[PDB]
Amino acid sequence: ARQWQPDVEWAEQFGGAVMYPTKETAHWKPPPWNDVDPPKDTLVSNLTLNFGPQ
Amino acid sequence: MNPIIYTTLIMTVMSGTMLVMISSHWLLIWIGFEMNLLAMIPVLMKNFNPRATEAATKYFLTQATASMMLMMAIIINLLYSGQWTITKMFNPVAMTMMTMALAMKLGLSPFHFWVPEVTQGISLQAGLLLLTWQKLAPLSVLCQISQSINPNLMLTMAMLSILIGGWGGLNQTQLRKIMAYSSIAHMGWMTAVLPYNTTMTILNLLIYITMTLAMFMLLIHSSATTTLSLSHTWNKMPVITSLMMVTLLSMGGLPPLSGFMPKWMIIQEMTKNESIIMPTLMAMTALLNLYFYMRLAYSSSLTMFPSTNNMKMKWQFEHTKQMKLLPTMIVLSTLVLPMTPALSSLN
Amino acid sequence: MLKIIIPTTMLLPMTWMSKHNMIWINATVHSLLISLISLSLLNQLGENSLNFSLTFFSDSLSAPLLVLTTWLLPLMLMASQSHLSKETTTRKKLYITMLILLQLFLIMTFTATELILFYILFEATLVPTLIIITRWGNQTERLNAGLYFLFYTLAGSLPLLVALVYIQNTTGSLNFLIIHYWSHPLSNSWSNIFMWLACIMAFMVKMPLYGLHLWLPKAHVEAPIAGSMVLAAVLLKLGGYGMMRITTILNPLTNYMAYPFLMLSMWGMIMTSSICLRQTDLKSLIAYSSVSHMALVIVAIMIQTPWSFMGATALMIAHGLTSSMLFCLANTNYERVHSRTMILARGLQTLLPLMATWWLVASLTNLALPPSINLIGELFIITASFSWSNITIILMGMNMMITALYSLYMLITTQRGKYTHHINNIKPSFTRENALMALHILPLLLLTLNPKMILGPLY
Amino acid sequence: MPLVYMNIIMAFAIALAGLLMYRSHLMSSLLCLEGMMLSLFIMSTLIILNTHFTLANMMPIILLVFAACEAALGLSLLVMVSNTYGTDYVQNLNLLQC
Amino acid sequence: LQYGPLAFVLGERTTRKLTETSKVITVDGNICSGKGRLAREIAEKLGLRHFPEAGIHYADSTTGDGKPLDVQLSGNCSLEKFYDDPKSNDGNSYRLQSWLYASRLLQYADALEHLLSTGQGVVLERSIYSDFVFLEAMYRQGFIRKQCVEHYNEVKKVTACEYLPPHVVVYVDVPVPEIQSRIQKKGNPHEMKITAAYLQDIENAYKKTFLPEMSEKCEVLQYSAREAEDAEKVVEDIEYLKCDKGPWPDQDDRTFHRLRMLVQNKLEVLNYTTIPVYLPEITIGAHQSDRVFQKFTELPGRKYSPGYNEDVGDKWIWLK
Amino acid sequence: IRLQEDPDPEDENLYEKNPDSHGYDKDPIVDLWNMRVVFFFGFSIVLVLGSTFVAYLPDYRMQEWARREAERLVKYREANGLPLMESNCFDPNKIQLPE
Ligand SMILES: CCCCCCCCCCCCCCCCCC(=O)OC[C@H](COP(=O)([O-])OCC(O)COP(=O)([O-])OC[C@@H](COC(=O)CCCCCCCCCCCCCCCCC)OC(=O)CCCCCCCCCCCCCCCCC)OC(=O)CCCCCCCCCCCCCCCCC
Ligand SMILES: CCCCCCCCCCCCCCCCC[C@@H](O)O[C@H](CO[C@H](O)CCCCCCCCCCCCCCC)COP(=O)(O)OCC[N+](C)(C)C
Ligand SMILES: CCCCCCCC/C=C\CCCCCCCC(=O)O[C@H](COC(=O)CCCCCCC/C=C/CCCCCCCC)COP(=O)(O)OCCN
Ligand SMILES: CCCCCCCC/C=C\CCCCCCCC(=O)O[C@H](COC(=O)CCCCCCC/C=C/CCCCCCCC)COP(=O)(O)OCCN
Ligand SMILES: CCCCCCCCCCCCCCCCCC(=O)OC[C@H](COP(=O)(O)OCCN)OC(=O)CCCCCCCCCCCCCCCCC
Ligand SMILES: Nc1ncnc2c1ncn2[C@@H]1O[C@H](COP(=O)(O)OP(=O)(O)O)[C@@H](O)[C@H]1O
């Protein structure tokens, strides 16, 4: 008794990383909302030096 | 970035492009390209994040390679003629190098990957400037040297651009990558007509720039970068979605909208030169672009997607910043078909 | 033509400036006035056309189509105001704006004197139709229907644009008068074959040709009632008008290239009638009936004789009126029971007698009952086909039998039998619906009284 | 054309093929980029000096200047990438896809 | 002109505007503590601007007329209903939590804009950073779901990562039995329905997460009920917190320009509060969204922009 | 449930509030005048006036002119013994055939 309008299933079919997912593209993930990726916990690895005894 | 530094970098980008456009010396044209790239990198990196850094790195690598190939072509031409003036090139090898370098700068296929990657990397304002201005310069150089362009190479790259743009846009669901693939296809159309009528190239450039400015400014106004983000705009400002839908229809080339004028004029001009297969294939391939424009139009205006609960607060508040010339871009990109014979003024 | 074009472009601001409750009244009244004004175009000549200016001209083929378009607009307004009660004022005005824009494009399409301006307008009609379908359709499938409609039409029509610009470069002009007076034979060559194909395929897709017709059930079933009315009554006739106009420059190659299209048309006429026999949906039944009748019109244009063109014109006008009326009747039933299935609502004669009468009259015109203009057009096409060959009579007779079968099957299924017991909300027919049916059906019988007005230029 | 021009053009082609074929490091590709402009400088000055184009002798200097600007730009981007990812590897520039 | 890049170029500098008493102070505590009274006293004695707790209808108070709007149009959630039926089947609890987070974010933006445009300090009765304690209490009591918590964390990340934390965090510690006693004396039935395990979860979140996290950013002042009663010693303790190890000393003119451009634009502040994450609690259908948006448009002073509403007595529209 | 969605509304009957309704509008006065203008303009004006106008359109198709011309031609040709229908449309003297 009313016009059909899209629901969550429709929206989620439109909300993936890409249209037409494959194995690789399903392994892909959509980008972050503010385009800022979380920082990577890289190791600074300061040089260690023996200053002495000689 | 300081506002003064930002505006001086924008002016430096524009100055490099203007030097390219007004110079009569190949060295000065190369200097203009270099100045444009140098001032353009920080604009891409304006909002610091790893994606922006990666996009700026890829753009720098591609543009540096293209500039190196361009200078090699210039030097090879000087070797065989002793001429520094930009006219018909006197060596076919130098002309091929120049065509490859300018195509790599423009993003014509098979030199297109950096276009979607960089555009997705950078913000909406940076993508707007990138597409518009950075297409504006190399096309002027190509128009200057058009009389020596190899038709086979140019038309091959143009058809590749149209096909690749259509297919990539079909797959994409991010708005910036959609815009990038649309840009690749439109560059294909312009360079396809290039070896026959630089006037038609300029007409297509102007119409494309108008439609792209309107589209990018609508995205900036609505703060939408994905399909689902743009699906919430009907519940905040339904006018913007309607204008965007009309602009998308215009971009797809439907009559009687302004996007039909360049395709029409280019098909006519190529037919005058006894080209039929190429215009027919080009016209049929644009249906892919129209398909993904229509897919975008279904989500945003012709259907009402679910919204959220904080949209009520968004209703309570009002948009502050005013886009400059957005109504004019909307009108020029949709309603100037009856003004077609002004391309003679453009001549 | 400006005395008809400007009042439509003035319907636009009037619609946007009228009050919230007067939009339907204003639009209907002034649409009727514009229809009355357009009735003056029927005073045609026997020698040549009405050359109003450099841009617009009218003929015995254009004038009835313009009158039908202008008459169809107020009926669409009535049906729309039936189904759009709860809409907002802005969206009601947008719907009326789409209808007005479609009418303006159709008027300029039928009166455009250049093939390129005709192309621009006949392609411009796609946008309002697509918006109407994919926005105000009810079901999920409106989106896919719009995609099918749009891409079928564009795939058909882009090679037409290439061919038109090529012909302009070759001959210097796309003006219809000039290409008629300066026409030359089309030699049998591959280049000419593909030019012929470009033009005819554009209009065959628009018609539609059998095998290029799936977009038609998709769009006509899934569109709102006004969309269905304009899709069947007028938009299908752009193909016939274009094919009649453009075949001036395609001879004698039309004698040899018409065999595949004639075979497709005759066999698909049979096939679509047989499909109509076994359809579980009412709107799909009416859509496939439209396909069969347009197949007959394609046969008429392809055999291309003075008797076939008159039958084609008569059948196009008659089918427009009849199919619009059938869609309106089905829509009233749907607004009762909210379902398109044909066997759900039965006994509608004992629940709604006057609507049963309207169903009877519409189905009697749908099958060719003499002396209706439906029969006049069908019979002229059949006679021309008989002169073309003598087995076309076999195919035509089979088609007439199947048409009568499925028309009366639809009538008996919906109206006769016993009412469904649990459907207890069949309210008495509204004055608006009754007046809509009367305004559909009376002009058809008056056209029977004066038939030379719809027989085209060859009369 | 003398064989000297052939060798200089061959050096440019080798440096171009080096740039287009990354291995892991971004610095190595930058060095390949700097070699291309060195070959361009040498070719330009050989052409100009042979023909006695006196006013064109300043062109190789401008070429060097903009080579320096490109090298500076590339090193700046390299330090930013290394700060983000810990190495100058080009495999880390894979967040953006085509 | 309003603040913008041109004003920055001309020479409007936030550092020059500030008067070294421009401090952001946030008072925190469990449910039904004296944090409101302490915050009012602190704002009054220090000459700062008081910001009452941002509940529902705060955005209503800051826009149009100050009068609150219909609950159907502003919030679509009920604190009283959350107390009555915490485990509802319509997602009322998480709808309320997300709306209150958005309101607190908007209020923090308002306070920062006031401080940056005036130089006068602000005293907020609760901030963005203390909002999650109720989320943890709801999750540990089974009121909301793990998906709700994940959506909250996503929005909080992308939103609160952009602002400057408070200068001073003043926490009022009141034991749970005393909290229940005060709640019972207050006599409101809905808050009398609060269980003791819910109150303990909020305190556990405050003591274990919020207070340790805010200690790294700057200094945290903790008081009992008796100490919070005497606000003079609280203001004296505030006035001698000369140390400042937060990002405020690191802030420069360009960073302040960026922050002020952000906080003067309320639609960009709330940009990520509506992300297309389709939780059943917060997602609203197309038809209900259309109906409610039409009703809000039909509201008296809401159809057009503020200066252009003729039904509320705006004139000279044709020249405006 | 996956959304906060409105229930599907009950169908609205125009005869409940207004028993003598024409189906045009919810408002009785607007509904009555919509019926009146549709009936008057459409039926009376367009049907009657357009039908009589089309019936009495001037004979610009030249049917009766052609009949009178044919009668004159037949009378003249049968008076003089000429064939009633000429064998050729054009003058063979004016036509010049190739050798
Ligand atoms: C002049 C009349 C119009 C003729 C049009 C012909 C073409 C002109 C193109 C440019 C027109 C100018 C720009 C108008 C923008 C209007 C935007 C707007 O807010 O409209 C609503 C607005 C009133 O509503 P509102 O209070 O603003 O509330 C808006 C809320 O959204 C209300 O809340 P809501 O939620 O209920 O509203 C939602 C609604 C709100 O959405 C809208 O209002 C958007 C409307 C469409 C966007 C603008 C498109 C412009 C591009 C060109 C194509 C336009 C064709 C349609 C034109 C519609 C004009 C309203 O959106 C939807 O429902 C979504 C529907 C999505 C599908 C339909 C939209 C796209 C249609 C166009 C595509 C098809 C083009 C086909 C190709 C051929 C083109 C010619 O309407 C007007 O103000 C009417 C404008 C005209 C007034 C009369 C002017 C003439 C006065 C008398 C002159 C006398 C001359 C002398 C005669 C001699 C005797 C004295
Ligand atoms: C209770 C009812 C019982 C049933 C009664 C009805 C059934 C009986 C029908 C048979 C009787 C017919 C009566 C005929 C009376 C004579 C009048 C008629 O013959 O005139 C016609 C006149 O034609 C009609 O006007 C038909 C008009 C066609 C409709 C025009 C459009 C109306 C506007 C609606 C727009 C619809 C557009 C649809 C696409 C075009 C035919 O032309 P003609 O007899 O020699 O004209 C005579 C005048 N002369 C001598 C000067 C030439
Ligand atoms: C808005 C500023 C003016 C805009 C100019 C209008 C647009 C034209 C394009 C720019 C042209 C600028 C003119 C500079 C070119 C001068 C060339 C010249 O004429 O040579 C000198 C000019 O004389 C000078 O010394 C001029 C010195 C100027 C130094 C200061 C210039 C300011 C530059 C500001 C830097 C801005 C950056 C520009 C962006 C990059 C470029 C696109 C004269 O030599 P003579 O010996 O007299 O020749 C006759 C032989 N007997
Ligand atoms: C033989 C032909 C002669 C016919 C002449 C007809 C001339 C017009 C007579 C019919 C007009 C109907 C109304 C006449 C006077 C109005 C009576 C009245 O007072 O009622 C009004 C009627 O109002 C209306 O319904 C509006 C309809 C009247 C105006 C529309 C008619 C204008 C037509 C102009 C015709 C000129 C066209 C000629 C050029 C051709 C253009 C193509 C109030 O009703 P509402 O407004 O709906 O009530 C709600 C208020 N609370
Ligand atoms: C030569 C430069 C041309 C472009 C200049 C554009 C400047 C404005 C850009 C912002 C967007 C448009 C303005 C919208 C309103 C802005 C807010 C406002 O209230 O503005 C008031 C302003 C009053 O006009 P005012 O500034 O006094 O005029 C210049 C006086 N020296 O109101 C206005 O100015 C409104 C009218 C603006 C002019 C019409 C829009 C451009 C017309 C171009 C004509 C040619 C068509 C092709 C254009 C191609 C793209 C430029
Ligand atoms: N994020 C939230 N979620 C649920 N309820 C909240 C939230 N924030 C505040 N409230 C409610 O708002 C009311 C505010 O009371 P409060 O101001 O703490 O009392 P007092 O003014 O005595 O300190 C409390 O009943 C509390 O339950």
UniProtKB/TrEMBL annotation, chain A:
Q: Spell out the subunit comment.
A: Core subunit of respiratory chain NADH dehydrogenase (Complex I) which is composed of 45 different subunits. Component of the iron-sulfur (IP) fragment of the enzyme. Interacts with NDUFAF3. Interacts with NDUFAF7. Interacts with CERS2.
Q: Which family does it belong to?
A: Belongs to the complex I 49 kDa subunit family.
* The protein's name in its UniProt record: NADH dehydrogenase [ubiquinone] iron-sulfur protein 2, mitochondrial
The record lists the organism as Sus scrofa (Pig)
Q: Coverage of the whole protein, first to last residue?
A: 40 to 93 of 469
UniProtKB/TrEMBL annotation, chain C:
Q: What is its main location?
A: mitochondrion
Q: Which residues form the NADH:ubiquinone oxidoreductase chain 4 N-terminal domain?
A: 1-109
Q: How does it sit in the membrane?
A: Multi-pass membrane protein
Q: Which reaction does it catalyse?
A: a ubiquinone + NADH + 5 H(+)(in) = a ubiquinol + NAD(+) + 4 H(+)(out)
Subcellular location per the Swiss-Prot or TrEMBL entry: Mitochondrion membrane
What region holds the NADH:quinone oxidoreductase/Mrp antiporter transmembrane domain?
112-401
Question: A cellular component term (GO) from this record?
Answer: mitochondrial membrane
| Single Gene Ontology BP annotation | ATP synthesis coupled electron transport
TM region(s), chain numbering:
21-41, 61-80, 92-110, 116-133, 145-167, 193-216, 223-244, 256-277, 284-303, 309-330, 351-369, 389-412, 433-449
Q: Which UniProt keywords apply?
A: Electron transport, Membrane, Mitochondrion, NAD, Respiratory chain, Translocase, Transmembrane, Transmembrane helix, Transport, Ubiquinone
Pfam families from the UniProt entry: Oxidored_q5_N (PF01059), Proton_antipo_M (PF00361)
Listed EC numbers: 7.1.1.2
What's a single GO MF annotation on this record?
NADH dehydrogenase (ubiquinone) activity
What family does the Swiss-Prot or TrEMBL record give for this protein?
Answer: Belongs to the complex I subunit 4 family.
Q: How does it assemble?
A: Core subunit of respiratory chain NADH dehydrogenase (Complex I) which is composed of 45 different subunits.
Function in brief: Core subunit of the mitochondrial membrane respiratory chain NADH dehydrogenase (Complex I) which catalyzes electron transfer from NADH through the respiratory chain, using ubiquinone as an electron acceptor. Essential for the catalytic activity and assembly of complex I.
Q: What PANTHER family does UniProt report for this protein, alphabetically?
A: NADH-UBIQUINONE OXIDOREDUCTASE CHAIN 4
- List the protein's name: NADH-ubiquinone oxidoreductase chain 4
TrEMBL record, chain E:
Q: Where does GTP 4 bind?
A: 32-36, 83, 97, 104, 126, 134, 186
Gene3D superfamilies in the cross-refs: P-loop containing nucleotide triphosphate hydrolases
GO BP annotations listed: mitochondrial electron transport, NADH to ubiquinone
Q: Which cofactor does it need?
A: FAD
Q: Where does GTP 3 bind?
A: 32-36, 83, 97, 104, 126, 131, 134, 191
User: Which residues take part in binding GTP 2?
Assistant: 32-36, 83, 97, 104, 126, 134
Indicate yes or no for the key word Ribonucleoprotein: no
Partners and quaternary state? Answer: Complex I is composed of 45 different subunits. This a component of the hydrophobic protein fraction.
What the record says about family reads: Belongs to the complex I NDUFA10 subunit family.
Report what the protein is called: NADH dehydrogenase [ubiquinone] 1 alpha subcomplex subunit 10, mitochondrial
From TrEMBL, chain F:
Which cellular component terms (GO) are annotated to the entry? mitochondrial inner membrane
Keyword Transmembrane helix tagged: yes
Please tell me whether the keyword NAD is annotated for this protein.
Answer: no
Membrane-crossing segments per the record: 37-58
Instruction: Please report the record's description of how this protein sits within the membrane.
Output: Single-pass membrane protein
**What keywords is this UniProt entry annotated with?**
Electron transport, Membrane, Mitochondrion, Mitochondrion inner membrane, Respiratory chain, Signal, Transit peptide, Transmembrane, Transmembrane helix, Transport
Localization per Swiss-Prot or TrEMBL? Mitochondrion inner membrane
Which residue stretches belong to region Disordered? 1-22
Q: What does this protein do?
A: Accessory subunit of the mitochondrial membrane respiratory chain NADH dehydrogenase (Complex I), that is believed not to be involved in catalysis. Complex I functions in the transfer of electrons from NADH to the respiratory chain. The immediate electron acceptor for the enzyme is believed to be ubiquinone.
* Binding partners and assembly: Complex I is composed of 45 different subunits. Interacts with BCAP31.
Which family is annotated?
A: Belongs to the complex I NDUFB11 subunit family.
Name the UniProt record assigns to this protein: NADH dehydrogenase [ubiquinone] 1 beta subcomplex subunit 11, mitochondrial
- Species of provenance: Sus scrofa
Q: What is the lineage of its organism?
A: Eukaryota, Metazoa, Chordata, Craniata, Vertebrata
Shown stretch of the complete protein: 53 to 151 of 154
